[model samples]
Target: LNTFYDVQQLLKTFGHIVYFGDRELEIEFMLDELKELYMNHMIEKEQWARAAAVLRKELEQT
Candidate 1:
């Protein structure tokens, strides 16, 4: 929830392992997957918000 690694760990719990060997692409797909997870009500709003912040921050920092 604080770093990209944390986000990856979260995705792992949901059986998602997002990586295209490209950092930006990895993040892009992760965000898409997160959206689907959220839409499906698999993750709570707060978790989604924090994970989203972490993802967006990682993208912006790069």
Candidate 2:
């Protein structure tokens, strides 16, 4: 997350859980991570997009 407030939203997703500054590729990596986590049962499916949504907006801020 780019700020504490953004971080807090993520905490709402999994209480835990970026990469290179390549925003596009980084976002892709993150999406894959979350997708697999949900797919493998680490996080609820609902959380899949929450992490993505929050992070995409954060990237736009950059």
Candidate 3:
């Protein structure tokens, strides 16, 4: 089961959709890239976590 931290982290990464205000419309575009990254196994579970952490850190800076 996913903990609140997991959900929060996931949402935070997903929040990139809104965080990138100027490029808000590009959310889907970014998601497609992320999907491709996942499909190609370029982003494994650990990588995803690290990526999410980076995203969250960037978001917090905004």
Candidate 4:
């Protein structure tokens, strides 16, 4: 199971780089952006759900 740091690292590798000086704020902003993108149908629900499930499983194992 992957930890939060692992997830963060993966996100960073996938171009979700947050500013080092304001990492918390950047993460919050990214979360909002992701929510907006999902709500607007820019991201498909099925894909999101699948990814979410994978993360959930990882967290559970941890």
Which candidate number maximizes TM-score?
1
lDDT of 3: 0.48
1-62 in candidate 3: lDDT tens per residue?
A: 13324433454564532344543233344545555667777657675565445544544554
Q: TM-score for model 3?
A: 0.38
- Candidate 2 on 1-62: residue-level lDDT in tens? 44435644554465334437576665566666667777888866666566667767866776
Candidate 4, residues 1-62, lDDT tens digits: the string is 13445545545544676665654555455555455556887667764454445455554554
Query: What does the lDDT read for residue 36 in candidate 1?
Result: 92
C-alpha lDDT score of every prediction, in listed order: 0.91, 0.61, 0.48, 0.54
**Candidate 2: residue 32 Cα off by (Å):** 0.6
In model 3, how large is the Cα lDDT of residue 25? Answer: 36
Best by lDDT: 1
Looking at model 3, residue 7 earns an lDDT score of 32
lDDT of candidate 3 at residue 11, scale 0 to 100: 41
Candidate 2: RMSD to truth: 4.8
Model 1 steric clash pairs: none
Per-residue lDDT, model 4, residue 19, is 65
Candidate with better lDDT, 3 vs 4 = 4
lDDT of 4 at 44: 72
Where does model 2 exceed 4 Å of error? 1-18, 59-62
Error of 2 at 35 (Å): 0.3
TM-score each candidate: 0.92, 0.54, 0.38, 0.44
lDDT of 2: 0.61
